[PDB]
Amino acid sequence: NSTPLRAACFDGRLDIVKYLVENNANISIANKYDNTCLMIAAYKGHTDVVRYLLEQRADPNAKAHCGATALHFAAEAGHIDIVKELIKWRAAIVVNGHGMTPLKVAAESCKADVVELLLSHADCDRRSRIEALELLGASFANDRENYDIIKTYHYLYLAMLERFQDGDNILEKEVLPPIHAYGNRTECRNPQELESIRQDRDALHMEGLIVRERILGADNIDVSHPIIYRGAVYADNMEFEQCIKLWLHALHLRQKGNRNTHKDLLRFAQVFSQMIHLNETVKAPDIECVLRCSVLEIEQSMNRVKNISDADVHNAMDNYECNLYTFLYLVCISTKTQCSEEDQCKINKQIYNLIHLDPRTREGFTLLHLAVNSNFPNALVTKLLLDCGAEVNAVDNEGNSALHIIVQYNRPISDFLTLHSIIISLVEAGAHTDMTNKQNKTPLDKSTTGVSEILLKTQMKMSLKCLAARAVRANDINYQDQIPRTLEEFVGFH
Amino acid sequence: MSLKPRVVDFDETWNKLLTTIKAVVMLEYVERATWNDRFSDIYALCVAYPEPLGERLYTETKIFLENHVRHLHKRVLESEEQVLVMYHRYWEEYSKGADYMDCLYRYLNTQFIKKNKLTEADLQYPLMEIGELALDMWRKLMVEPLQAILIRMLLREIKNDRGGEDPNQKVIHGVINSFVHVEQYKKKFPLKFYQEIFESPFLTETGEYYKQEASNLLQESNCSQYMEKVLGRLKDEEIRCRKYLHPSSYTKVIHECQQRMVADHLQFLHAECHNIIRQEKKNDMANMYVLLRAVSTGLPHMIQELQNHIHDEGLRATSNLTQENMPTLFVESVLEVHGKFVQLINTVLNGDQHFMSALDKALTSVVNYREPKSVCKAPELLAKYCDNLLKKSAKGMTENEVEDRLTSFITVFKYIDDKDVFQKFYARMLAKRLIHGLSMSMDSEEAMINKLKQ
Amino acid sequence: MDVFLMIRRHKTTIFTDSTVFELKRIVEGILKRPPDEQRLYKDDQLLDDGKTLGECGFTSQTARPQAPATVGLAFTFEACIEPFSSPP
Amino acid sequence: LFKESEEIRTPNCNCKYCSHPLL
Amino acid sequence: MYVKLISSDGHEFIVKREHALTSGTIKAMLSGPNEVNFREIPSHVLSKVCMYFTYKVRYTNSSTEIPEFPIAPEIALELLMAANFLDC
Ligand SMILES: [Zn+2]
C-alpha cells in the first residue's frame, strides 16, 4: 500500500515532495498500517517536509492503526522542531491504543526537552505532568545508552515536589508491591526517601524500575528492555542471582505480553553456558526448573500458533528449532550441574512433560535424534532423555531411528567413550538392532565406523523374529491377513 | 496348524481358561498337556483377526482374580485368632499361583499389556502386567482391608516373643516378607508399603517396650548387672531381628533399642564411670566400651576419665621416688606405666585410637611437669640415662640389653615435649665422654644416634 | 567336534553333538535302550560300530548346527525314517 | 560481551511500541 | 537335561534342556504344573526352531563370522509366526 510520496517523504527530498504535491499527490491515503506521509516525516524529523505538508492542508490529527499520531512519533524520536510545528498547527492531545500520550511518549523515550515543550503546552494536567516527569526519570534510570543518574534524580525529585507542591492535597504514588525479582525494594512516596536513595546508584535504578513497572504495567507495553539492560549489567557485575531474577520477571512479563522470546531464552541459556565455562557457576538447579517450565509453556504455545496459521510461522518455525536447541543446551547444563533429588525430580518432570508430546521437527527429528547428531553428540544428554521417556525406536521423516544416527558418527576415536556409552544405553530399554530405514538397510550396514560396528555387533541379541523378518522382506511374500497384527508392524520394521 | 489368526469365540476359550486358572492359582493339580494347550489358547485369544480379544482377556482375568481375592478375604476374616496362619497359607498359595499364571499369560504380558502399560517416566512423572496384577490387587483387597488386624497380631506376637514364648517363626517371617513381596516390583522404593505399615508401628512399640524394660532393669539391678543385662538384650534383639524382620530393618531396630536402652540413661553410666575406671573392672571396662561405642555421648567422657586415671597413677608412681640419683628408675617407672595402660587398652578397649590418644596425653602431662625444683629436669634425666647406658662406667654391660633399653627409652623420649635441652645436654655429655674415652662401643653410640634419626 | 546329527527313529528325531559307539551311548542316555540292540544307518547304509564318526562322512562341512546331517536309527533288525509335514 | 536484542522495526508501521514481525 | 518337543503333526524332537531354555515361552511351559507337546506347531517349523537352538549355542559370540540361518521362502511366514509363539 506504499505510495511514491511516502518514499519521497522517507528519503527527505524536499524538491521531490513539492514537485509531487503540485502534481496531484494523494496524502490522505496511507499504507497498510494506515501511516501518513506527515507522520512518517515527523518520525524522521524532516522539518521542511513536515511544514510543507501541514501547509498543504494535510491532516495533522491523523490516527494510525494503533491510535498514535505524528506528534507521538516526533516525541519518540526527539524532534523538538517537529512537535513545536505540530503544536503551532494545533495538534490535539491523543491517547493511542497503547494508552499513552505524546507527553508520556517523550517521557518514555528520554527526550527531556520534548517533555519540557509538551509541559509548556497549555492542554496538560497536573497528574499528566507528574506522571510524565516520573516516567522520564524512571526511563533515564534504566536507559541503555541515554543513562544519566543526575538527570534521573533531578526529574524524579521535581516530579515528587510537584506531588507535594500543594499543601491542601498531596498526590501519593500508587506504588506496586516490592518484587523479589527486582530485589524487594519499594518505590518511594516522600522526597526524603528519594534524597536518601539518590546517593545509592543501584537504589535509584531500582526506583526507576518500580516507577516504570507501575506506570507502564497497565498498558500493553514491552517493558522488559530496561530489565534486559539492567540484568546484563548485573551479569557483568557477577551478580547473576539478581540478574537471573530480573530475566525471570522479564520472561514472565513477556508471557503476559504474549511476545516471542526465543532470543531471550537463548541469552538466558548462553549466560549459563558462560558461567559454567568460568567454573564460578554454583548453579542452582531449582532456578533451572523454572526456566525449563517456562520454555516448555512457550514452545507449546508457539507450536499451537504454528498449527493455527502455517502461512506466517516460517520465522516461528525457525524459532521452534532454536528453542529446541536452547532446551538441548539446558539439558547440557543439567548434565554439567549436579542437582538435588527434588531439583533433579523437577527437571525430569519438565523434561517428561516435553517428551510426552512428541516435538516433531523438520526431517522428523525428535529430542534424542537432535541429541545424538551433530548440531556436540552429547552423551549424558541422550542418557537423560532416554531416562525421561524418550523413544529409542522413534522414526524420523527419513525413517531412521536413534541408533541409526549415532552409529553414523564421524571422528569415532575421539569421544569414543561417549559413543560407547550412548550405544550401551540406547540398546537397553528397547532398541531394535536391525531397523531398516527408507529402502531396506541395516543400522550395522549404515554405520561406516568399524569400532561402532564392533560395539553394536557385541550388543546384538539374535532372534527368529529378526532373521525371519529379513527373509520374508527379501522374498516379498504377502504378509497381511496371515500374521498377527502386532507382528504386522514388526514385518514392516525389517 | 492354524497358527494364522482365526475367528475365536472368546466365551468358550475364556470358559475353559477359567477352569484352568482356578486350579493354577489355587495350586490344584493341572495336567501338563492341558497347560501346553492353554498356552496356544492364550495365543489365539491374544490374536484374532476380527478384533484382538486381549483387552477382554485382561478385563475378565481381573474380574476372576477379584472374585478369588474377595472370597479369600471373606474366609480369612471369618476366621478368628488364626488370621496370621490363614493369611500365610493363602499367601503362599497365591504367590505360587500368581508366579505360575504370569507364565500362562506370557504373550499377553509381553505383546499387549507391554505396549499399552504406562512407561517408567509416566509413573515417575491402570494397565500393568498380569503377573504383578494379582499381587497389586492382593495389596488392594487383602492387607489394606485388614492392615490394622494384621499389624496388631504381628506386634502382639513379637511382644510375646520378647516376653519369652516362642511363636511360629515361619508364619511371622512369611507375613512380613509378604508385606514386601506384595510390592516386590515397583521400580521405586520397594519398601514403601513395608516402611509405612509395619516399620513405623513396630519401631514405636519396640521403643516403648524397651523404655519400660530399661526403667525396670535400672530400678531392679546395680550398674554392672544392669549393663550386662542390656548387652544381652541387645544381642537377643539382633537374634529376633534376624529371625523375623526383613534384613534392611535390623540396623533401625537395633539403633532404636540401644538409644532407648543406654542413651536414655547415659547419666547413670557417666556417673559410675569415674569409680569404675579408677577401680579396675576390666570386664566392665570392655562392656562399657561396647555399650557406648554406638551412643556418641558415652565415648568422650570415657576418654577423659581414662586419661585422668592414667595421669594420676603415673604421676603418683613417678613422684614416689624423688632425687633417686638414678634416672633409670624414673624411666623404668614411666615405661611400666605406659606398658600397663597400653596392654589394658588393647585388652578391654580393643586398642581404640581415642583411648590411646588419651593415654599419650596423660603420659605427656607426666614427665613434662615442673613440680620438681629443677625445671625441665626430664630431658636432663634422659641425657643422664643415655650417658650411663653409653659410658663405660667401669662396668661390662651386654650390648643387646643396652639396645633394648635404648629402644624402650625411644618411646618416653617421643613423649617428652622439649628435646632441644636434651640435645644440648647430649652434645655436652658426648663431648665429655669422648674426652674421657669411656664408652661401650662407637657402633652402640652410633646406633642410638641412628635411633635418634627415626 | 563340529558335528551335529539328526538321529531319527520313525517319528522320533533327537538332536546330538568322534566315535559311533559313544553316539550309541548317548542314544542309551536319551532313549534308554541297550546299545547293541540298535543299529545306525547313514542314508540306509549300515555304519560299523567303533569307527570314527568323521570317516563315515560327517564333518564340520556337512554337520553344521543350522543344517545337521541325518543318521537313521533302527531297533537289532530294522523296524524307517518318517518324513516331516509338507510345507503349505 | 553482551548483544542487545535486535529490535529493528518494521518500516511500514512507525509506532515503536507496536511489534510487527518481519519476514 | 533333555526336553521332548512334540509337534502337532506327531513328531517327538528331543534336544538338550539348555538349548530349549533360550525361549521365554518354553521356560514358561516347563515351569509350573518335560514332555512339552505343541498342539499347534507343525513338524517342519518345529524342526527349524530346533536347529536354531543348537545354532544359538555354537558359532555365536564369534568375532570371525556368524553364519546366517537358512530359512526357506515357503516356511518363512509361519516360522516368523512361531517366533512370536515361542517368544524367541
Ligand atoms: Zn529383527
Residue A62 backbone class (left: φ over 0; alpha: ψ -120 to 50; beta: rest) = beta
Domain map of chain B by residue range? 10-181, 192-264, 267-365, 377-453
Compute the distance between CA of residue B392 and CA of residue B221 in angstroms, rounded to an integer: 63
Q: Tell me the one-letter amino acid at B155.
A: L
Determine the 3-state secondary structure of E69 from DSSP: coil
Please give the tally of structural domains in chain C. Answer: 1
Judge: D1–A315 Cβ closer than 8 Å, yes or no.
no
A25 phi and psi angles, rounded to 5 deg: -85, 140
Closest CA to A361 of A375, A349, A345: A375
Beta bridge partners of E5: E13
Residue A10 backbone class (left: φ over 0; alpha: ψ -120 to 50; beta: rest) = alpha
Report the gap between the CA of B187 and the closest CA in chain A (Å). Answer: 13
Q: CA angle, corner E29, sides to E23 and E32, nearest 5?
A: 130
DSSP B318-333: HHHS-S-S-HHHHHHH
Contact A340, A285 (CB under 8 A): yes
Pairing mode of beta strands C45-46, E12-16: unpaired
Judge: E33–B107 Cβ closer than 8 Å, yes or no.
no
Beta bridge partners of E4: E14
DSSP E38-55: -SS--HHHHHHHHHHHHH
Compute the distance between CA of residue B211 and CA of residue B157 in angstroms, rounded to an integer: 19
B376 CA distance to ligand 1 middle (Å) = 89
Give the residue carrying C-alpha cell 474380574.
B63
Q: Name every chain A residue with its beta carbon within 8 A of the beta carbon of D23.
A: 314-315
Resolution in Å equals: 3.6
Contact A229, A144 (CB under 8 A): yes
DSSP A158-195: HHHHHHTS-SS------PPPP-TTTTS-----SHHHHH
Q: Name every chain B residue with its beta carbon within 8 A of the beta carbon of A388.
A: 121, 125
Instruction: Report yes or no on A489 lying in a domain.
Output: yes
Query: How far from each other are the two terminal CA atoms of chain A, in whole angstroms?
Result: 57
Compute the distance between CA of residue E87 and CA of residue A487 in angstroms, rounded to an integer: 12
Residue B437 backbone class (left: φ over 0; alpha: ψ -120 to 50; beta: rest) = left
Closest CA to A172 of A127, A221, A129, A140: A127
A-contacting chains (≥3 CB pairs under 8 Å): B, D, E
B47 closest CB neighbour out of A353, A355, A485: A485
Q: Name every chain A residue with its beta carbon within 8 A of the beta carbon of E56.
A: 462
Q: Tell me the one-letter amino acid at A256.
A: K
Please give the tally of structural domains in chain A. Answer: 1
Q: C-alpha B189: how far from its chain's center?
A: 21
Q: CA angle, corner A130, sides to A129 and A131, nearest 5?
A: 95
Instruction: Give yes or no for E67 touching A (CB within 8 A).
Output: no
Compute the distance between CA of residue A156 and CA of residue A61 in angstroms, rounded to an integer: 31
Q: Tell me the one-letter amino acid at A417.
A: L
Compute the distance between CA of residue B212 and CA of residue B217 in angstroms, rounded to an integer: 9
The residues, ordered by sequence, that sit 6+ positions from E81 with a Cβ below 8 Å of its Cβ are A483, A484, A487, B3, B4
Length of chain B: 454
How many Cβ pairs within 8 Å bridge chains A and D?
62
Q: Tell me the one-letter amino acid at A375.
A: N
Give the nearest chain C residue to E17 (CA atoms).
C15
DSSP D1-23: -------PPPSS---TT------
The Cβ of residue B118 has, within 10 Å, a number of other Cβ atoms equal to 12
The arrangement of secondary structure in B267-365, i.e. its CATH architecture, is Up-down Bundle (1.20)
Annotated binding site of D: 13, 15, 18, 20
Compute the distance between CA of residue B377 and CA of residue A348 in angstroms, rounded to an integer: 72
Whole-angstrom CA distances from B24 to B85, E9, E75 are: 22, 28, 35
Beta bridge partners of C73: C40
The Cβ of residue B224 has, within 10 Å, a number of other Cβ atoms equal to 15
Determine the 3-state secondary structure of A144 from DSSP: coil
Annotated binding site of A for Zn(2+): 65-66, 98
Compute the distance between CA of residue B3 and CA of residue E41 in angstroms, rounded to an integer: 7
The residues, ordered by sequence, that sit 6+ positions from B426 with a Cβ below 8 Å of its Cβ are B383, B386
Contact A59, A34 (CB under 8 A): no
Sign of CA dihedral B22, B24, B28, B30: positive
D2 phi and psi angles, rounded to 5 deg: -120, 145
Instruction: Report yes or no on A473 lying in a domain.
Output: yes
Compute the distance between CA of residue A371 and CA of residue A379 in angstroms, rounded to an integer: 8
D-contacting chains (≥3 CB pairs under 8 Å): A
Compute the distance between CA of residue A465 and CA of residue E88 in angstroms, rounded to an integer: 7
Closest CA to B225 of B146, B287, B175: B287
Instruction: Report yes or no on A163 lying in a domain.
Output: no
Solved by what technique?
Answer: cryo-EM
Compute the distance between CA of residue C37 and CA of residue C29 in angstroms, rounded to an integer: 14
Give the nearest chain E residue to A459 (CA atoms).
E61
Compute the distance between CA of residue A91 and CA of residue A85 in angstroms, rounded to an integer: 9
Assign domain B377-453 to a CATH class.
Answer: mainly alpha
Whole-angstrom CA distances from D5 to A263, B196, B234 are: 7, 54, 70
- Runs of H (alpha helix) within B369-398: 377-390
Q: C-alpha E20: how far from its chain's center?
A: 6
Residue B144 is given by DSSP the state G
E44 closest CB neighbour out of C11, C12, C84: C84
Q: Name every chain E residue with its beta carbon within 8 A of the beta carbon of C17.
A: 54, 58
Cell numbers for B153: 497380631
Give the residue carrying C-alpha cell 516527569.
A133
C30 closest CB neighbour out of E2, E42, E53: E2
Q: CA angle, corner B225, sides to B221 and B227, nearest 5?
A: 110
Cell numbers for B383: 641425657
Contact C7, C23 (CB under 8 A): yes
Structural domains in chain E, CATH included, are 2-86 (3.30.710.10)
Whole-angstrom CA distances from B99 to B15, B37, B95, B129 are: 21, 19, 6, 12
Maximum distance among all alpha carbons in chain C?
A: 41
The Cβ of residue C30 has, within 10 Å, a number of other Cβ atoms equal to 18
Compute the distance between CA of residue B232 and CA of residue B230 in angstroms, rounded to an integer: 5
What number of H helices and E strands is found in chain B?
22, 0
Residue C75: which domain range?
A: 2-88
Whole-angstrom CA distances from B431 to A338, B43, B386 are: 67, 104, 14
Residue A478: which domain range?
A: 462-494
Q: Tell me the one-letter amino acid at A191.
A: P
Give the residue carrying C-alpha cell 557385541.
A458
Compute the distance between CA of residue A379 and CA of residue A409 in angstroms, rounded to an integer: 13
Q: CA angle, corner B185, sides to B179 and B188, nearest 5?
A: 95
The residues, ordered by sequence, that sit 6+ positions from A17 with a Cβ below 8 Å of its Cβ are A5, A8, A9, A49, A52, A53
Whole-angstrom CA distances from B444 to B399, B402, B453 are: 7, 8, 14
Cell numbers for A414: 575421539
Q: What is the CA radius of gyration of chain C?
A: 13
Compute the distance between CA of residue A273 and CA of residue A275 in angstroms, rounded to an integer: 6
Contact A473, A464 (CB under 8 A): no
A277-309: buried (b, 16+ CB within 10 Å) or exposed (e) per residue?
eeeeeebbbebbbbbbbbbbebbeebbebbeee
Q: Name every chain A residue with its beta carbon within 8 A of the beta carbon of B52.
A: 485
Compute the distance between CA of residue A124 and CA of residue A116 in angstroms, rounded to an integer: 12
Beta bridge partners of C46: C41
Instruction: Provide residues of C within 8 Å CB-CB of chain E.
Output: 2, 4, 11-15, 17, 30, 64-68, 82, 84-88
Among 1.20.1310.10, 1.10.1060.10, 1.10.8.60, 2.10.109.10, name the CATH number for the domain at B10-181: 1.20.1310.10
Sign of CA dihedral B57, B115, A483, E24: negative
Residue B143 is given by DSSP the state I
Give the residue carrying C-alpha cell 520394521.
A493
Interchain touch E–C (≥3 Cβ pairs closer than 8 Å): yes
SS3 sequence of A71-140: HHHHHHCCCHHHHHHHHHCCCCCCCCCCCCCHHHHHHHCCCHHHHHHHHHCCCCCHHHHHHHHHHHHHHH
- Runs of H (alpha helix) within E1-88: 17-20, 24-30, 43-57, 73-86
Compute the distance between CA of residue B284 and CA of residue A164 in angstroms, rounded to an integer: 85
Report the gap between the CA of E35 and the closest CA in chain C (Å). Answer: 13
E51 CA distance to ligand 1 middle (Å) = 19
Q: Name every chain D residue with its beta carbon within 8 A of the beta carbon of A2.
A: 12
The Cβ of residue A41 has, within 10 Å, a number of other Cβ atoms equal to 28
Give the residue carrying C-alpha cell 475353559.
B16
Closest CA to A288 of A338, A359, A357, A213: A338
Closest CA to B210 of B268, B153, B156, B264: B264
- Identical fold, B10-181 and B267-365: yes
Instruction: Give yes or no for A355 touching B (CB within 8 A).
Output: yes
Give the residue carrying C-alpha cell 524520536.
A77
D15 closest CB neighbour out of A64, A312, A314: A64
Q: Chain B interface, mutation test: which of A392, A463, A479, A483, most B Cβ atoms within 10 Å?
A: A483
E8 CA distance to ligand 1 middle (Å) = 27
Cell numbers for C31: 532313549
Contact A332, A370 (CB under 8 A): no
A472 closest CB neighbour out of E80, E82, E84: E80
Contact A261, A296 (CB under 8 A): no
A396 phi and psi angles, rounded to 5 deg: -80, 180
Compute the distance between CA of residue C13 and CA of residue C81 in angstroms, rounded to an integer: 9
Annotated binding site of D for Zn(2+): 13, 15, 18, 20
Compute the distance between CA of residue E53 and CA of residue E74 in angstroms, rounded to an integer: 21
Q: Chain C interface, mutation test: which of E6, E11, E61, most C Cβ atoms within 10 Å?
A: E11
Contact B46, B8 (CB under 8 A): no
Instruction: Give yes or no for D8 touching A (CB within 8 A).
Output: no
Judge: B3–E81 Cβ closer than 8 Å, yes or no.
yes
Report the gap between the CA of C56 and the closest CA in chain E (Å). Answer: 22
Burial class of residue D14 in the structure, from the number of CB atoms within 10 Å of its CB (0-12 exposed, 13-18 middle, 19+ buried): buried
Half-sphere exposure of A489 (CA within 13 A, CB side): 7
Closest CA to A267 of A330, A217, A343: A330
Pairing mode of beta strands E2-6, E12-16: antiparallel
Contact A332, A378 (CB under 8 A): yes
Determine the 3-state secondary structure of A22 from DSSP: helix
